[PDB]
Amino acid sequence: RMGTFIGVYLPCLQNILGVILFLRLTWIVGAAGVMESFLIVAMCCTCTMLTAISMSAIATNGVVPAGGSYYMISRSLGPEFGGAVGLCFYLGTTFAGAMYILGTIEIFLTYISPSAAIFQAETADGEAAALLNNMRVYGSCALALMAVVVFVGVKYVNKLALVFLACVVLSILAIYAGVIKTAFAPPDIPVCLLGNRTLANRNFDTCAKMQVVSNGTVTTALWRLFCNGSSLGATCDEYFAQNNVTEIQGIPGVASGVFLDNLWSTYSDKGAFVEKKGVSSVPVSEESRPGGLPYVLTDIMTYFTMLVGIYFPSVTGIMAGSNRSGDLKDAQKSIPTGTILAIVTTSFIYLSCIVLFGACIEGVVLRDKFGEALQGNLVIGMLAWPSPWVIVIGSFFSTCGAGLQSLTGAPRLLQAIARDGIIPFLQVFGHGKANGEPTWALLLTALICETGILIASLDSVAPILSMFFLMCYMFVNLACAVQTLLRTPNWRPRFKFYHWTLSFLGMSLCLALMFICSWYYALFAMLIAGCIYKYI
Ligand SMILES: *[C@@H]1O[C@H](CO)[C@@H](O[C@@H]2O[C@H](CO)[C@@H](O[C@@H]3O[C@H](CO)[C@@H](O)[C@H](O)[C@@H]3O)[C@H](O)[C@H]2NC(C)=O)[C@H](O)[C@H]1NC(C)=O
Ligand SMILES: *[C@@H]1O[C@H](CO)[C@@H](O[C@@H]2O[C@H](CO)[C@@H](O[C@@H]3O[C@H](CO)[C@@H](O)[C@H](O)[C@@H]3O)[C@H](O)[C@H]2NC(C)=O)[C@H](O)[C@H]1NC(C)=O
Ligand SMILES: [Cl-]
Ligand SMILES: [K+]
């Protein structure tokens, strides 16, 4: 028997906090402004808070059965809602596992061991075409190893969830320690630029121009990289000879300097240079030549309503506190307080991190997303106090642990759906090992997660996860609303602060979020969502 803290509040903090806060929150604050990102996080936290209130009403209605969240949802709501919500949350869990192991592999390939990942080509576009294949092969390897270890060592991972959560909370503590200690002695982070273009200092040092005085008349290492020859006047690029070089102080301390700079959105295109406003730059207007030059070039084009689909997995995962409802003591009291306090905690964390990222990191550093301008390091790791080597290993361990947790929880939930004869076409996934864990569902989960991982892009596998979780939350909200609306013979919720209009407002809210994220998926998603509903 467990209580309130370890029973509910820690698993929610464990599975909510994940890869996005470490790998894409800074890029999101950079591409949009502080205001747009504020609006994004307000929406994505309001939908989850309203869904949590409705789910707490479910949790306090009646005698909650023991087991997972599916038993609660099925017993309280109708059976057909149970199957639809279970299918949606199952697909969400497996695609979230795909995204989490993708984040693990991205960390390992990009930040820790760059002298790795053999599957590469030597061409300007060859790297952009071979990164996907390299991430695909490492993804297949990691998924296979993950399924193998979760098929054997199930008694190992549950004792390791404590270590995973300790690692991620230590990472958050380090980020706050850095953002507080930057007020007295900010670090000396150099970022070099020609004006409205900035350079990726992976290779060179001392970004000053032609002659650093060793004897006074030797070319800079940067000079050779732009110019054809290591000599003066060796037919260098015209943009190099028109514009000057300078060095800006990346990550200034949080004092009145950059908050007004990073305020409004930019919404750059794909392939354009990352630009700093204010500095003077003359144009050329006859040549671009972006291939082999050390300019940092952007990722996929950034417009609003795409950042919603990138960001939303950062706030999801609230069905975890309702996962261990069998082993609680007075679960109807533990769940509605623990879940809502968890969402309040994570929303406070995200709002604080946004308002601090807007006010400490330079706006040209924010749009890096790969650390190409900070000597190939991590930007949020360079923000931390002791060393960036704690944040990279922290995110590595936490993301690998979250992936293990998803690959543990999704097959058990699929097995619990299949045991009930709600789906007669999929009864075969009811066989399990004599110990009691599922075996045949694990194959299907690993296969669906591989189908997810073959897309091999964290920025285009996140919207699928977002749409699935939005559909699940919308179904739960609509179910509670219409249940208390039609005054069903068995719907007696005992939660104090629960209306019929509050769940309706949540339903409409993340309906608008789904419609604003991607509408082309939304059409056929709502089409099949109604179609699976009538079959039962
Ligand atoms: C390279 O960086 C320097 C900043 O150190 C800038 O070039 C600077 O440009 C200004 C404006 O043309 C120059 O000032 C002028 O200076 C002369 C010097 O006698 C003065 O008589 C004029 O009244 C005027 O104030 C300044 O000398 C020059 N500094 C240099 C070359 O070190 C500029 O930001 C960059 N140059 C570019 C983009 O061409
Ligand atoms: C960084 O420096 C460049 C180099 O001067 C500047 O580019 C300026 O960017 C604006 C907005 O993209 C351009 O404006 C628009 O240009 C089109 C081109 O025909 C014109 O038809 C529109 O009416 C509008 O004025 C501007 O031409 C361009 N100036 C240049 C290239 O000399 C700007 O300071 C920075 N680049 C940005 C913000 O993209
Ligand atoms: Cl959830
Ligand atoms: K999450």
Numbering used by the authors: 117 to 652
Task: Give the published text.
To achieve the highest resolution reconstruction, the nanodisc density was subtracted and particles were subjected to focused classification and subsequent refinement. The resulting map, at 3.65 Å overall resolution, enabled complete de novo modeling of the transmembrane and extracellular region of KCC4 and includes two partial extracellular glycosylation sites, a bound K+ ion, and a bound Cl- ion. KCC4 is monomeric in the nanodisc structure. We conclude that the monomeric structure reported here corresponds to full-length mouse KCC4 with flexible and/or disordered terminal regions. KCC4 is observed in an inward-open conformation that exposes the inside of the transporter to the cytoplasm through a wide and electropositive tunnel that may serve to concentrate the less abundant intracellular substrate Cl-. A prominent feature of KCC4 is a large extracellular domain, unique among proteins of known structure, extending ~35 Å above the membrane. It is formed by EL3 and EL4, which pack together and cover ~2/3 of the transporter outer surface. In KCC4, residues in EL4, TM1, TM3, and TM10 form an electrostatic and hydrophobic interaction network that seals the gate. The stronger of the two densities between TM1, TM6, and TM3 is modeled as a K+ ion. It is surrounded by electronegative groups contributed by backbone carbonyls (N131 and I132 in TM1 and P429 and T432 in TM6) and a tyrosine hydroxyl from Y216 in TM3. The second site, between TM6 and TM10, is modeled as a Cl- ion.
